[PDB]
Amino acid sequence: KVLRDNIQGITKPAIRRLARRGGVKRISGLIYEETRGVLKVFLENVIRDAVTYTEHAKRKTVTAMDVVYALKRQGRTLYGFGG
Amino acid sequence: NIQGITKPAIRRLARRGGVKRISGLIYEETRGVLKVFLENVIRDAVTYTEHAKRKTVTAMDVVYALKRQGRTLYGFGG
Amino acid sequence: TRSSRAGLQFPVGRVHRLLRKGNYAERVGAGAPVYLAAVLEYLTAEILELAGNAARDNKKTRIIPRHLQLAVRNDEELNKLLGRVTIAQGGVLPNIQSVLLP
Amino acid sequence: AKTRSSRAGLQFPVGRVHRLLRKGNYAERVGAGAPVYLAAVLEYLTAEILELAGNAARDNKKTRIIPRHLQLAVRNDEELNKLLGRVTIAQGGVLPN
Amino acid sequence: VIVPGEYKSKYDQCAVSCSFKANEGYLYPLDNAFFFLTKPTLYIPFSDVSMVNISRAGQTSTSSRTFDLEVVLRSNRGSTTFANISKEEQQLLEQFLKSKNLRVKN
Amino acid sequence: TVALREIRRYQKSTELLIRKLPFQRLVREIAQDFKTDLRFQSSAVMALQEASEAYLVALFEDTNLCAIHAKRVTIMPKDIQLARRIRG
Amino acid sequence: HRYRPGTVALREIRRYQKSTELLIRKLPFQRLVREIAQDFKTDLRFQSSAVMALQEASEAYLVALFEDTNLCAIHAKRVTIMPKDIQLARRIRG
Amino acid sequence: KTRKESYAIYVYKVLKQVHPDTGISSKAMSIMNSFVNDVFERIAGEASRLAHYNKRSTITSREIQTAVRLLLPGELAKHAVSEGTKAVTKYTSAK
Amino acid sequence: TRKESYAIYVYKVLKQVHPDTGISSKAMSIMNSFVNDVFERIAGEASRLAHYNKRSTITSREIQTAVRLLLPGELAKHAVSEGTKAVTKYTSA
Amino acid sequence: LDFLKQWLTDMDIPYTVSTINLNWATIMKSLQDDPYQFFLDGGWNFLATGSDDEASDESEEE
Fold this sequence. Notes:
By secondary structure, chain C is mainly alpha-helical. Helix content of chain C is 56%, strand content 6%. Chain C has one domain (1-102). The longest helix of chain C is centred in the middle third of the chain and has 27 residues, at 31-57. The radius of gyration of chain C is 19 Å and the shape is elongated. Chain F is an all-alpha fold. In chain F, 75% of the residues lie in helices and 2% in strands. Chain F is built from four helices and one strand, in the order αααβα. The longest helix of chain F is centred in the middle third of the chain and has 29 residues, at 42-70. The radius of gyration of chain F is 16 Å and the shape is extended. The relative contact order of chain F is 0.09. Chain J is an all-alpha fold. Helix content of chain J is 37%, strand content 0%. The longest helix of chain J has 10 residues, at 2-11. Chain J starts with a helix and ends in a 22-residue tail after the last helix. At the C-H interface, helix 2, strand 1, helix 3, strand 2 and helix 4 of C face helix 1, strand 1, helix 2, strand 2 and helix 3 of H. Strand 1 of chain D pairs parallel with strand 1 (22-23) of chain I.
């Protein structure tokens, strides 16, 4: 149907815990929305490539294989899912 | 050798980059960076030649090496 | 001839042979060289038109690498397609930071 | 002996790796010398990562190796960090700093 | 009583969302004031409104919630800047603003 | 002071900080634009989430480094765009 | 007239941004490259076009790195670039 | 000398088809030939990868279509798929 | 269904390098994808090198130079030594 | 690390090696409030971990 504010589903504490895993000490307020946007752009890039692989595959499901293959095109290969 | 890449030339590079004022340690540090990057490219180039069984560093091999590094170059090779 | 049949400039038969030779597959489709030649010709058209416009701006009738670099970097799309690539003798777009100015 | 992996003495499958190179269309015909050497390279690399992962596991005191150990070894070892810098290991985490 | 306005925003919506004090809230136009919700609920009456201005950058991302609108109230010497406005929202707001005959500085 | 710990606790853990189901809904939301009736694999959703997690972690590392250059212990958004542009 | 500090530098910024010429001198750089390549295979010869390719690749790398260095300095609220800026830029580049 | 093949004749033809007056220097032509070869190599690599991924030997037009949809930023990709589908239809019509 | 897995051999390598150590299925998948990735990297480099030097067949020489290029320094040295030993034992047999 | 251990043994100061983290602030406040409350709640052995979590896997064979 239709979904909204799902990028807002990324929570302020989630962003702060991410920044702290990444080493940040004090976090300005404006960081959260822009990190949400950065995550968003990265996700349309990955999902576009994955869905394109699937449309080639004549398949209605986006396999983790196609996900990995999209990440490999992006140059940020991940190990552990599919093969 | 690396000192041949001298202060006026480093200033010219930085002015192409955009830099207005330049600190003095910039010249030495940039010389070091140039040393490092040149090593990285040349190792792949000469390895390509040893495969090729040639004794000269061909520009085509240079383009292939820069392609492997990802800093691709166009024009000086096919 | 097949290039005339497909109404294209870039060579369909050459692309077919070179795809066969490249070992891209055991088999190479009939419309594959047609389709690929069309795509390559379109890319050459795009780059050449943009470079020609830049050349007219720079008051020239032959396209030098500076025109190619200017076209690629100024065009937002082509900058992404050729971002890692560096063009020989192309140079850098004139961009100067605000704080530097008097 | 009878099997090619045994005639070499390699653990990873020489015959299968030959089949993969032949099917991948990496060349018109792959030579017989190539797959043995390649299987040797994969053996050495997997051995290196597995030794480092087990060493990290022994520091952690856990007998099993987990992707935290796998990522910890990769990031910490400079050399293999250059080999797999672009890679991300799933559920690896980040090193202390 | 105050009745909600019949002025339709983007996608038939009745308000426009934007960030404030590190918080996202809505703007509702009305006959005699703007009402900004919900923390802190702010009233901007048109009579007190001195002037408004628009600030914009040049980039491909300008189409996605970028334009900004700065209003000044002279009675309190209060300046408030309204960030995160897109092309369509800015156009609809400006259309409302000419129709209401408010002084748009530029 | 608990802020300073709060760096060092989550650094060890392998947990995925972003909650699972809002990420699933986000991923399907983005999917709808390019194609609908798309039935993602759960493995595919986790694969997306892990890569996003790592990318943001590296971004915040570069951000804090920018701040330390600036003599600012607080990350500001200028750090975000600076890291993004230098990374290219 | 005695130019105030910085104006001539800005002029050169415009000048060499306009130009499309090699800013490092050919024989010094060729000597440098040959000195690096002594280690990997001694007595190695170079195709001259290959040397030109190494040179312009290095020019592009150093130009982009100085751009990043200047961005780091402007972020640091300092007009003059410092080595600090170069380390920061390369560390972000990774 | 050896017979060395370059795409310069076709680049030069297209340059007339789009801008008849303008010519191309030999160095810029080398750059353009490198660009054509690189674009073809990237597209062919992706198309072969797709065929291998999906267990399809033949590189049919669909594979390269996906390759163009993927490699290019989309706003060229839409065009590029369009002319290519047109071309395959034309070649099917002709014999 | 048959699944093409290096896991069966990777487990043997794991026990030889470290007898008592065990492996999670998750780490085992990490290794399987690792071997696939490195194999594709080296094989692709060898294919490009065969085309570049116009050779129509990949051989041990192509693979060892591909190792020299892709691996960094120390792993490149040890890998080429182990690999040349391996083709040496295979040929001597 | 070995040099630090030898030096501390020479000074005759017992040392602890661990990986866990708590505040220094709350421990300082509580121990000014009562110097012996932390010895009552177990002394410096609390840093040693006895039960954090359990992790395992089903199997790995083929």
